[PDB]
Structures are given as C-alpha cells and as structure tokens.
Amino acid sequence: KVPPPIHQFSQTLDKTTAVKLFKLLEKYRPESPLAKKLRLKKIAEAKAKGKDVEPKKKPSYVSAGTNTVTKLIEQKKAQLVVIAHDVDPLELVLFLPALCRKMGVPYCIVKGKARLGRLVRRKTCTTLALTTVDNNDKANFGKVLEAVKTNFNERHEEIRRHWGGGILGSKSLARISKLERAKARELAQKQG
Amino acid sequence: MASKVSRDTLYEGVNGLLEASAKKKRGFLETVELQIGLKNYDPQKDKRFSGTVKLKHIPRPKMKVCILGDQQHCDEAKANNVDFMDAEALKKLNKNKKLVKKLAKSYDAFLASESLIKQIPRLLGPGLNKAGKFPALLSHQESMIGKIEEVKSTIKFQMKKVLCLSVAVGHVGMKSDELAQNVNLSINFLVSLLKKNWQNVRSLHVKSSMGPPQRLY
Amino acid sequence: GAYRYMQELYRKKQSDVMRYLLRIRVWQYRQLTKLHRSPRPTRPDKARRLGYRAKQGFVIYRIRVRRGGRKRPVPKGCTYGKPKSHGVNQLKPYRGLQSIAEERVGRRLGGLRVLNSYWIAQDASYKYFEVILIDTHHSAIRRDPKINWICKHVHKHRELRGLTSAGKSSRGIGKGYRYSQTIGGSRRAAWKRKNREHMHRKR
Amino acid sequence: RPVVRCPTIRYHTKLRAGRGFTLEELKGAGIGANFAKTIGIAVDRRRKNKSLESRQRNIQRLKEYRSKLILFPINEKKIRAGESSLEECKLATQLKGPVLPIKNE
Amino acid sequence: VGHAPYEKRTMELLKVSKDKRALKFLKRRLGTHIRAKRKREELSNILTQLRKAQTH
RNA sequence: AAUAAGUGGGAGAUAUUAGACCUCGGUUUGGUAUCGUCAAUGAAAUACCACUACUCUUAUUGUUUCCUUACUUACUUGAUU
RNA sequence: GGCGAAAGCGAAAAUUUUCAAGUAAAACAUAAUUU
RNA sequence: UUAUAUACAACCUCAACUCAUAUGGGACUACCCCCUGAAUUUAAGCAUAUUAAUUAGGGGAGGAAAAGAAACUAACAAGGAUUUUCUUAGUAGCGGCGAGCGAAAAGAAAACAGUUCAGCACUAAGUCACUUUGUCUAUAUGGCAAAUGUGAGAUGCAGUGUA
C-alpha cells in the first residue's frame, strides 16, 4: 500500500504535454562543451584587450540537480520545476513537490531520469529548473504552465488524500473474480 | 441547536467581540443572566461564589436597596441619594404586605447595618431562605463608602445548588466597544472569586433574559 | 540545499513513507550476497558527513550482521571452573555490530582502507550496514590533499586496531572523570601505568 | 604564557602555567590576533576571560613585552616598524635569554 | 511524512482524554520526563492547529 | 396555575395589532393575551429565559488481554534439468 | 551462497547469476541438453 | 516501441575477460592497537571477591604506536588539547564492609601546535583522473600545454568557510 507521498510518482505528466515541454527545454540546454571554450578562448585572446562587461548576454538556461533547485525554490527564483520519478533512493527528490506546493511555484514530474540527463549531457540529472522569462518562448511558456498548474499544483491539494493500492493480480485476482462469475449464477436462479 | 447571534461552538478571536450588541433583537430591556459550568468548584462546601464586580461603565441594573441606618449608613450617603431611613422598613418587610403591586422580598441586593445583624436571619431569614435574596456580610454592605458604588451597579449574586446560574449583570442594548473594557475587566474580577485558578473551565457562557446563550473564548 | 532535507527526512523513521522505503529496501537487500558492492551510496547525505566524495574511487559495500548477543562457544561442555564463569547465554560482545560489520569487510578486501559506515536498514535477524572504503593507490586519491592522509602506512587496517569512528566507540576513550580509567592513551595502557612499579634510583 | 589565578581555594595565587592569551587580551593590546601567533605570544583561543583585572593583568603583560620585542624587518625598508632596524638584535640585544619570567608572587 | 504511532496514539489520548495519561505514556515511550513534557506541548499545539484551518 | 427540572435572576416578558418610521417585515406605543415577575403566599414565588446533563436516546469515524473466517507480499518447507 | 571477534568449521553441501564438463553450431544472449 | 510479436537509443542494476595498470596476503616480537579470557593461588575451609579486567593471548600497525585540540575541570580571585613523571594517596570509594582492592581535579615539572570536514548564500563545474601530441628534465605511481580524446562528475566535484 504505497503511501500517498507516492503516488506523486508515478503520476507523471501525460505525453501530450511533455513532448511540448522538451521542445521548450532544448533551447535551454545548459552549455555547449566546445562553445564554453569558444566563449572563453575569445575572452582570453580577443576580449583580453577589449575588457567589456555589457555584451555578455547571460544565456538563461536550466539549473540542474536538487541542491541547486532546492535553493532556487526557497529563493522563489524558479518558474518551473521538473523532477524525474526514477530516483534512487527517493529522498533526493521526495520532498520537492511539497516545497513547490508550499512555495507556490509550478512543478512537473516527468518520466525518465535518463531523459533529463540527455539534455544536460550527463548520465542522469533527476531535477531541472527554469528561471528563463525571455519573450521568444514566453507564449508557449504560459500555456505549458497552465497545463502543470492543474495537472499538479492545483491537483496537489487533493493528491495527498488519495491512495487505494495493493492490487492483487493476476491469478489471485481473477480467481476471486471467478468467484462472482459463478456464485452470481446461484444469485441469478434464487432471486429469479 | 445554536442561533445566529449566540455563538455556541465558535471560539471567536479578539476582533469579533463587536457583535455582542446584536443580542438586542427585542425592544424591551433584558437582564444579562450570566452562567458557567464549573469543574472542581463545589458550591455545597464553603466556596460560595458571591462577590462584587465593580465595572467602569454602568449598564444600570434596576436595583432597589433598603438601607438600614443607625448614625453610620445615611450620614455620608447623600451624594448618591440614599433612602435616609432609620431601619424601620424591616418591621414591615416580613409577615405582611406593603401595598398594591408589591411583594415582601422587594429588592435585588440588601445592605444591612453592623449592629442589627441578629434580625436578618431570624425574622427576615424565613422570608429569605424562601426567597434566596439573603444579604451576606461580604457583598460590600457597610455604607462607609459603599453607597456611591451601590447604585453604580453593585451586583450581589447568590448560588444555586443545581449548578445553574441566572443573575442580572446588565443589558446588551449598548455598543460592544463599551463592553470592550467591560467584559475584559469583569472576567478578571470573576476569576478572583475562583480558587487555584489557571484554567479549570474550557469555555465561557453569557446569556440575556430573552436571548439564547452566547459563548466566547 | 537538499541535503539538509534528506537529513531530517531519514530521521522520521516510524512514519508511513519511511517505513515502506525501509520495508522494500530490506527485501531487496536480503536476496543477495552478505558482502556486496553497491555502486552508489544508499544514503548519499550520510555518505557525506562521514568522509565520502563522488570521485573515483570511493567504494561502498553492504554487509549483513547476524544480530544478537554472543553465545560463548563452549563445547556443549562447561565453561569449567567457578560459577562466576558459568554463564553461556546472556553474554554480549564488547564490540558493536557496526564494528563487526567493518571488520568482515576490511578483512576480506585487504587492499582498500575503511573510512566509516552507516546503518541503512534492518529486520529482526540481520542488522545491516553500508561501509565506505577507499583504494589508497588510485591517483585521484593520492593526489588529493584532503583525503591523502589515509594513504599513510600508519593506517594499515585501521579498524582491526580499533581506530575508525565506530571502532573508538567500544574502547571507551573520552574525557575526563567518567573516562578516567582509562586515560593512558588507550585502555590497556592505563592498567600498565597504574600498576607500574617505579624502582627509583635514589630511594 | 599569560595568567595568574590558579583555580581552587588552596592555590588562589600559585599559577596554573598560563596556556592562553585569550583573544580579547590581544585585541585589547594593539595586536594583531593572528599576528601575535607569528611573533610568539601563544594566542590559544580557549579561555573565556572572566575578569576585568585578569584581562588587564595580561594586557599590561602584553604591553610590557611588545615594548621590548625587537622586531626584525622583512625587506629592510621598514615603513611601519614599530620599533627599529638599528635596534636589530646585533646592535641592541641579540641575547636569546633563557626564562621569560612571570614576576612571581 | 506524517506522524508517528506513539504520537498518533497519544494525540487520541489528548483530544479530551486525560493528558496526564498522555504524559505517562510519552515518558513510558520517549522516555524522559522532559522529553515527554516537551512532546506533549507539540501535540497540544497540533490539535489546536486544526481548530479552524481544517474546517473544509 | 398545577406538577416552577430545579432554583434564582426578574419586579414583567413575549406575541398580536394599528399608529410612528422604513421600500417592507418587524420592533416599539397602548389595547389584549396562557400563565406568571405581583397577588394567590408556601419547599423552591412559577412569567420571561437557561447553561447543564442523565433515565437514556437515535446516530458518529472508538483504541481495545478482543475474537472468528479469510487474503498474500514478508517469512517457511517441499518439487523439478 | 553460509557461519564465526577471529583463527577457522564432529560440512551424504543439499540454496552459490552462466553456480554447466560441453558442440568445425544459422540468424534477431549454437541447440534439446548437465547441477 | 514492452500479445514476453522485431529493432533502435538511453539509464539503472549486473555480468564476463590470460583486457591495460595497480594494490592485498609479511614473517619478526621487546615496545604498541583491538579482541578474547581461565584456573593455580589468597581468603588459614569455600561459593561472590581475589588472582586479573592477567598467563595462554593472537587479529592489526610504526619507529614509536595509541592518544589528542573539550558534549573537560570546577565552584575559585577561576582554570584550558593529549602523553609522561612527582605529589595528591594506599586517599574518596568499592568489599562475604571480610581477605582485600583503589582512582582522579587541583599543584609541580618534561614537552608544548595547532586544526580540517559535512551542513544556509559561495551565486556560470569555477572540478578531478588517465589518453595520445609536443615540451621540461629524469630512472619523476611528474610538470606545462594540446586535442577540450575518453571517462568521472549535478545522486554533486572545486573555491570560501567550522562547533
């Protein structure tokens, strides 16, 4: 009987919406490997004599990992939390919804912790963040937050009060179903 | 089983005291019959819950007082309109009737002299254990200074042996901002009459003569 | 950060969440071999606080330890001699069960030094733990001037000489009064020096 | 090695041998709390100085020495000495005398 | 994470039901007459933390 | 007035009605009213109005040395390549 | 696989992923197979 | 994409390798660290006690080890890591209160040295290990770069910081 802090996992943002989320997040892949060098190898040579601070244009990308994100929620800075559900053990992530339900920030739970790792170019990443409010994707940003607010956030305050669970299956299940498929045929003739 | 103005369950906070004036749904004036359920306060013992709650704003209980005077009661008490009698009304207060539309137990709080206490339970007492309006010796009955306060809402209350209370303390027709300083100081003067008190009762009760009982934390 | 949260969350063990997460984690860690390599630490916050980092190679193992007081292994046939010694079935070790865990690891993996351990789960016939080891010849630990001190020789087999954290427990070392006997260094070196006959040259 | 005032009622006066100099006494005496250790003042930051007068007893001890504590310069320009480089020890003392006495009771 | 069953079974002793026997139970469980004292104030607080916030 | 739970507040409430006023009920004023505060007089002065709670009552999600029957996922043994 | 603080073990083990002894055998872990 | 109908790509968990490179198992015994643990004896008997928290021990180290920078003392006019010696002291206490055992604070001296983590805030992984190409010299389980060549690493490495 898996206790209703689980399910929060694995009610995990059905894939009509989640494909649109990963279409958003690809622009916020964190840092290219080579272009990190290409950012700083031209600072080192060309902008050594330039010494500019203004044209930096800090790309506003995902923050990764829980201790970054759990900072970023208690500082109210994140606009979107993605937490995976395949976490081992669980406590790296387990409290994170009941933060975002308390701090108010809209969180989503997305299937795959390897899928999160692929866009941040590590093996596994378990939690992303979104501080980015640039207008080039703000239009998709609003409706994709209006999905997760009723899917998770406005759903969270009655997520916790529900767990049925302990499903038997299949042999022990269909036998007691086969109790009613025959014993009601004694109830079909007695009350008949 | 509760009404709209007399809150039963709701332990209302410090800002919802302003609705205590809303018990006046009648037009005639009603006497606020206070009551409380006491745990570990036995009235059969010497703990007789009887005192005086001197409150700053007077709700004017309609109280007639006969003042037995022997050169000590009515000499100073002309500033508060004492009756100025020489204790001769006690000769007719029992065993007979005074006039039409009048009883023989005709007060709310009795104040007696110190030198004529012997006739209070003997000739007057059989007319008062049948009445329950017996003057004590601790209900501020001396008339040295205790007559300016007597028309200034001196409530003398006697105890029932069935663990119910109903005694006039005032009215509810006036604004609860006047009762903001009244109920905050009366309940400090009621708990002084209690013994070893921190919290022996969970919740309080208050009730008018024509209204349902209010309750308040 | 998250690490303070999962600190506080592991503490609430009698709850409904953390009574299932330790119920499943037992009947995962029972159908395996008693000494066993885990990749990752189970509790990565108490892998921290105890000296683990996420660099190669900090190694972890899970041990089960058969859980109960020690029956004096006497041949069916008596602990002979005086009735003071006649006790068989209520004897209790002077070592832990956690220290007895680290031993059976560190005995077995002779070329890796032990750092600490932690409790991970238990059920009723097997208390069982999670030991942190460190190869002391990997270069990423030899280069490391924060972890380098375990590479010295004076730490060979550092808990078969009692010197981890959960080894120093059972000695009895501390200060002062309550730990007075024994204040010679360790615990046996106190009765050496209490009993010492000083045969001074100039009596 | 600072103190006076060994603890109990027997030795109200005969010293426990002063480990401390307890950072208020450094801060109360013109140094240089981290700096005092680099001279050799023995700064040991476990004592929670409980008296005015015990704090003064060592502050004036920290003023007696540091007034006789000669100072070698580093680069021999010596802009803030405070003592000298012609009281460099060859000129003035060079002693390394033996006891550093306690003024003893 | 929810409560604990020595507290969840002493909250039920603490609704009305003679919180001396709550104290005699936590000191039996926790168990030390200040830990039991300092646990009874918490569950007194939580039972009055639902006084109107959990109306609906 | 009995049979005032009782016993004290109270020394009249409440209701009705038209009038006053309001968009209106209503409250008030007075008339009237089952009693009664009053009188009827005694053990409670019964009206007006109660907190309390049982004789108990229906009903509510109660832990329980409960108990009984089942369930399987822990655990246990047996069987096969 | 186990056990024991260890050393070590009145071990016809009876559980230890392939815990196999294996074959000039095809694809998309050579096939019925050996505890 | 998972009627156990094929494939792909990840990840987790786990295998195998005469894979490339590494550690591990000494034996000594005086000292040292952890265990485990008698009985002879003494009590003029004897059973707790005593031997002795010791022989036998019995696993693990070093040139010393262990300890060690207060969850300490104390009650003062306050002390200040550990270890060792002197004294406290054969004392407080333990004990068939019997035989017997038995410490520490303070004082004196030897020597004296301090510190690092984890964890809120520290707000661009700033991080390591090899890998090949040079360079630097050496028998460097190296340095400087380079490809940013794998890999580790956000389930967090680094800097700053510590009761």
Author numbering:
A (entry chain CG): 80 to 271
B (entry chain Cz): 1 to 217
C (entry chain CN): 2 to 204
D (entry chain CL): 55 to 159
E (entry chain Ci): 58 to 113
List sentences quoted exactly from the publication behind this structure.
Protein synthesis is essential across the tree of life and undertaken by the highly conserved macromolecular complex of ‘the ribosome’. mRNA translation is regulated at many levels, but until recently the ribosome itself was not thought to be part of this control system. Here, we have characterised ribosomal protein heterogeneity across 4 tissues of Drosophila melanogaster. We find that testes and ovaries contain the most heterogeneous ribosome populations, which occurs through a combination of paralog-enrichment and paralog-switching. We have solved the cryo-EM structures of three different ribosome complexes purified from complex in vivo tissues; 80S ribosomes from the testis (3.5 Å), 80S ribosomes from the ovary (3.0 Å) and polysomal ribosomes from the testis (4.9 Å), improving the resolution from the only other previous ribosome from D. melanogaster.
Three-dimensional classification of this testis 80S dataset identified a single structurally distinct class of 80S ribosomes, which was refined to an average 3.5 Å resolution. Comparison of the testis and ovary 80S models revealed that the main difference between them is at the P- and E-sites. While the ovary 80S average did not contain any densities in this region, the testis 80S average contained densities that did not correspond to a tRNA (circle). In the testis 80S average no tRNA was found in this region. One key difference was that the testis 80S structure contains IFRD1, which is a homolog of the human IFRD2. The presence of IFRD1 suggests that a significant proportion of the testis 80S ribosomes are not actively engaged in translation. In mammals IFRD2 was seen in differentiating reticulocytes, whilst in our work we found IFRD1 in the testis 80S (but not in the ovary 80S), where it could be involved in regulation of translation during the differentiation of spermatozoa, which is central to the function of the testis. Specifically, the three switched paralogs (RpL22-like and RpL37b in testis 80S; and RpS5b in ovary 80S) showed the largest differences in their atomic models out of all paralogs. Additionally, analysing the fit of both RpL22-like and RpL22 into the cryo-EM density of testis 80S ribosomes showed a better fit for RpL22-like, further pointing towards a paralog switch (Supplementary S12). This was also the case for RpL37b in testis 80S ribosomes (Supplementary S13).
